């Protein structure tokens, strides 16, 4: 469960948030495969409630109606086609599994679903599964509202409705079986793993019982006996009865402290400085590296819909964002997940964005295709951070130094730091309010290296800055505090 199952040499996954199956298939062959990406996390592929007020919000996909592979992203045939094409080019697919609940109990009965399936939250009737009143925790929950009111109570957090979402009785073999049936269908199609949504709201034992009924990965692409990669979405920030470690037996867990702390440091908040990142990792109270899934931001907290809140860095803060993602990709702690989002009309009303519900680029509900501009960027309002030179080149950086130890760390006691990875890569950061000009030990063999942040290496040529490493692995670095990108990165594969 703990192994990503990615092709050897691929160390990251990208969350192509709300992308259509056909666009992901193309992206796999035209970009992800050749640029070294390990995998892709897709939005929930199962049928959900169609919400028209607001209008097709992004969160409607976290309200299941059935387990039919029928969504705004595409149908079953298109999903199968995408998984096959991606696996054929060495890019894995990870599915966002929404198995803790169904749709909101206050949602109107009818056929307002992505596949026309009928459902009735009022009577707990979901005939397309099929599920009935006997498959929910309405009798288990002992709160007055029926929803979760006390997070200091593990039992209600697990047996009560999370913000009104119908809570499934995962202790029932029938329900566990229906879920495993859905996940096994996806495994046979070819998915390499799953993101367990709202894992904190499920008992670790119930999850285990479900994983027990899962098949091994498709033997056409994976070695026999291969188990699906499992990462559970658990928001653990410190003083709650429920701990991330409670889920270590099922697989990896999302480390939400990673992005929250990194954002605070990069922003130079609460007195933090990049100099403290010397012991970054478990030393900061994070879960063991071999059990962590890290990221700077995600679809939830990038809108303020999650853990971290205000310190979270996202594409809106491009300069600091690129620096944060760069540091994460260069650091050996955990398995890294990169975010890929879309732009929305942000509107704040006293510190709160009233348009945080806005769904993906669309034409009257129909998701707009991802267009590629001549400069390899995306159009139609898709941000495509994974296509940003500074981010994509750092993704490759992590692959190149995969395995090398954290070494040659340097810091000025403030916000100017540098460190290498064995003898395969070196990165320098200048987050202070003054220029950086110093000769440092890189631990890299002598030669001319192309800075992969300001440019690229193309057939014995650099399109950006060039770094000269001498015989003793020493090299000079100059980064102005006013530089577009205040950091430099070089590695074994960027050497001329
Ligand atoms: Ca639950």
Swiss-Prot record:
Superkingdom of source: Eukaryota
EC number: 3.2.1.1
Enzyme class name: hydrolase
InterPro entries: A-amylase/branching_C, A-amylase_C, Alpha_amylase, Glyco_hydro_13_cat_dom, Glyco_hydro_b, Glycoside_hydrolase_SF
Keyword Calcium: yes
Phenotype for residue 298 to S: Reduces affinity for chloride; reduces activity
Glycosylation (residues): 461
A Pfam family annotated for this UniProt entry: Alpha-amylase_C
GO molecular function: alpha-amylase activity; calcium ion binding; chloride ion binding
Keywords associated with the record: Calcium, Carbohydrate metabolism, Chloride, Disulfide bond, Glycoprotein, Glycosidase, Hydrolase, Metal-binding, Pyrrolidone carboxylic acid, Secreted, Signal
Tissue: Detected in pancreas (at protein level).
Modified residues (Pyrrolidone carboxylic acid): 1
Disulfide bonding pattern of the chain: 28-86, 70-115, 141-160, 378-384, 450-462
Cofactor(s) demanded: Ca(2+); chloride
Location within or outside the cell: Secreted, Extracellular space
Main location: secreted
Positions that bind Ca(2+): 100, 158, 167, 201
GO cellular component, one term: extracellular region
TM region positions: none
Residues the record lists as binding chloride: 195, 298, 337
Sites annotated Transition state stabilizer: 300
Family that this chain belongs to: Belongs to the glycosyl hydrolase 13 family.
Assembly and interaction partners: Monomer. Binds to the sea anemone inhibitor helianthamide.
Alphabetized PANTHER family for the sequence: ALPHA-AMYLASE
The name this protein goes by in its record: Pancreatic alpha-amylase
């Amino acid at each position: 469960q703990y192994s990503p199952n990615t092709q050897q040499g691929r160390t990251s996954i990208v969350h192509l948030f709300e992308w259509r199956w056909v666009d992901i298939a193309l992206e796999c062959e035209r970009y992800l495969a050749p640029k070294g990406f390990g995998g892709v996390q897709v939005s929930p592929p199962n049928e959900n409630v169609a919400i028209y007020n607001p209008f097709r919000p992004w969160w409607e996909r976290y309200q299941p109606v059935s387990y039919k592979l029928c969504t705004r992203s595409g149908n079953e045939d298109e999903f199968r086609n995408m998984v096959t094409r991606c696996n054929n080019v060495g890019v894995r697919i990870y599915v966002d599994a929404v198995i803790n609940h169904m749709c909101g109990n206050a949602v109107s009965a009818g056929t307002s679903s992505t596949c026309g399936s009928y459902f009735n939250p009022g009577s707990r009737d979901f005939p397309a599964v099929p599920y009935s009143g006997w498959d929910f925790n309405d009798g288990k929950c002992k709160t007055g509202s029926g929803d979760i009111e006390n997070y200091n109570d593990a039992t209600q957090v697990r047996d009560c409705r999370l913000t009104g979402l119908l809570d499934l009785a995962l202790e029932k073999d029938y329900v566990r079986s229906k879920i495993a049936e859905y996940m096994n269908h996806l495994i046979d199609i070819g998915v390499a793993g799953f993101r367990l949504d709202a894992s904190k709201h499920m008992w670790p034992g119930d999850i285990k019982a479900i994983l027990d009924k899962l098949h091994n990965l498709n033997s056409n692409w994976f070695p026999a006996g291969s188990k699906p990669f499992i990462y559970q979405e658990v928001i653990d920030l410190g003083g709650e009865p429920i701990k991330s470690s409670d889920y270590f037996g099922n697989g990896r867990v999302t480390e939400f402290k990673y992005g929250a702390k990194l954002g605070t440091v990069i922003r130079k908040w609460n007195g933090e400085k990049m100099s403290y990142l010397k012991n970054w990792g478990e030393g900061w109270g994070f879960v063991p590296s071999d059990r962590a899934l890290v990221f700077v931001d995600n679809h939830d907290n990038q809108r303020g819909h999650g853990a971290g809140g205000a310190s979270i860095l996202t594409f809106w803060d491009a300069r600091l964002y690129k620096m944060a993602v760069g540091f994460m990709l260069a650091h050996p702690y955990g398995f890294t997940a990169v975010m890929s989002s879309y732009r929305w009309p942000r509107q704040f009303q006293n510190g709160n964005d009233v348009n945080d519900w806005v769904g993906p680029p669309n034409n009257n509900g129909v998701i707009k295709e991802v267009t590629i501009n001549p400069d390899t960027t995306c159009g139609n309002d898709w941000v495509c951070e994974h296509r940003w030179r500074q981010i994509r080149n750092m993704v490759i950086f992590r692959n190149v130094v995969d395995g090398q130890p954290f070494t040659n760390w340097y810091d000025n006691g403030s916000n100017q730091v540098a460190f290498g990875r064995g003898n395969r890569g070196f990165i320098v950061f200048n987050n202070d309010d003054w220029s950086f000009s110093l000769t440092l030990q890189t631990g890299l063999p002598a030669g001319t290296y192309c800075d992969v942040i300001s440019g690229d290496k193309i057939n014995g040529n650099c399109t950006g800055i060039k770094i000269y490493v001498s015989d003793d692995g020493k090299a000079h670095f100059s980064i102005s505090n006013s530089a577009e990108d205040p950091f430099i990165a070089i590695h074994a594969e960027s050497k001329l």
